[PDB]
Design a protein around this ligand. Structure first.
Ligand SMILES: COc1ccc([C@@]2(c3cccc(-c4cccnc4)c3)C[C@@H](OC)C(N)=N2)cc1
Length: 372
């Protein structure tokens, strides 16, 4: 009953239906492994189809604590409380959880995204206003018998599955390979090697994780530290040199379009991210095809052709393996065993020549520790 419980628009996140309060109020909620608050629209906003009405819920309790979150791309503010929360196409339970009722915001809600709040699935360390505010998943596990694990299968064109409490074997093929969760704050991981069409970027591996690397379903792009980003764009450019693209394309701002069905996938290279394995100096790789890192835009006005944005961008806050990386993998957030599994998803990307893959093991004898 949990399969196919996600929806989404390209570049706008994936969301799950939830209810809040009594009687239940239905909301679509963005599934966000890069944050740790359950935060929902709770006042009118031009971009909100609907919002949480606390006065209509007889089970609401105000915690009499406010919360204000300025972040890079926007800001939001509201009031903390608790109320009854359920996931209709998730586990068959209702729990009491913290809820941040969003009363003011700037560039937080997205016009036409079809979601009205965010379900932060990461750990208390990064909850706002501080780490004493217990995140949703922690309340779910505490109050029920649900195992301390969830998995995400995000699919491109959008839709997918969030399975809570276990692994659905129908959602992947081949082996599940695990990388340690380095620290329970973000879902922090370690990248030990990067190749672009099999060619090693040859950087000290600490560079790949300056200053952290995270798995974040609430960021669209693959985001890379400046030095890594510059190196990767240079290699992608060298491989795709039979065609030259506007400057703005590489800055992730500008569309490139081809006539229907003629996208030259074969001129774009595959990116290999090798992730730390569960045993010393062993790793596995996930391979990323241009079908993932050239994100298709779905706008009626541009629909005659196939148009894309370059979904790799420069970061000053570390590597972010965002939704375009997660797409086509089945990703297991095995909180109980402090690890994240990757497998090829049933909706994995492929063409006649190449397929997204998860492969291992690889051993590297002369390895420093790759973490910051
Ligand atoms: C608790 O405060 C926040 C602040 C920002 C976020 C976002 C967030 C906020 C609003 C919208 C999105 C979003 C937008 C487009 C596509 N996907 C997600 C993300 C930012 C992003 O990390 C940089 C992330 N993982 N979640 C979540 C909770």
């Amino acid at each position: 009953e949990m399969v196919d419980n996600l929806r989404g628009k390209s570049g706008q996140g994936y969301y799950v239906e939830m209810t809040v309060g009594s009687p239940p109020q239905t909301l679509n909620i963005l599934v966000d492994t890069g944050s740790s608050n359950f935060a929902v629209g709770a006042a009118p906003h031009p971009f909100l189809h609907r919002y949480y009405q606390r006065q209509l819920s007889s089970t609401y309790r105000d915690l009499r604590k406010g919360v204000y979150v300025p972040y890079t791309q926007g800001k939001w503010e509201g009031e903390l409380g608790t109320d009854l929360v359920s996931i209709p196409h998730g586990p068959n339970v209702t729990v009491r959880a913290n809820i941040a009722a969003i009363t003011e915001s700037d560039k937080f809600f997205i016009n036409g995204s079809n979601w009205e709040g965010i379900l932060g699935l990461a750990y208390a360390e990064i909850a706002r206003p501080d780490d004493s505010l217990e995140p949703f998943f922690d309340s779910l596990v505490k109050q029920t018998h649900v195992p301390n694990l969830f998995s995400l299968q995000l699919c491109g064109a959008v839709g997918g599955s969030m399975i809570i409490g276990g692994i659905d074997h129908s959602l992947y093929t081949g082996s599940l390979w695990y990388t340690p969760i380095r620290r329970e704050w973000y879902y922090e991981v370690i990248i030990v090697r990067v190749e672009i069409n099999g060619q090693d970027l040859k950087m000290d591996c600490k560079e790949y994780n300056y200053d952290k690397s995270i798995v974040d379903s609430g960021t669209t792009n693959l985001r890379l530290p400046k030095k890594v980003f510059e190196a990767a764009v240079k290699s992608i450019k060298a491989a795709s040199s039979t065609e030259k693209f506007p400057d703005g394309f590489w800055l992730g701002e500008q569309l490139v379009c081809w006539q229907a069905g003629t996208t030259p996938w074969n001129i774009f290279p595959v990116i290999s991210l090798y992730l730390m394995g569960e045993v010393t100096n062993q790793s596995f790789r996930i391979t990323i095809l241009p079908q993932q890192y050239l994100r298709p835009v779905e706008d009626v006005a541009t629909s005659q052709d196939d148009c894309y944005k370059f979904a790799i961008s420069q970061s000053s806050t570390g590597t972010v393996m965002g939704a375009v990386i997660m797409e086509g993998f089945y990703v297991v957030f095995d909180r109980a065993r402090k690890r994240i599994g990757f497998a090829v998803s049933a909706c994995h990307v492929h063409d006649e020549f190449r397929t997204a893959a998860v492969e291992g093991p690889f051993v590297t004898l002369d390895m420093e520790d790759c973490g910051y």
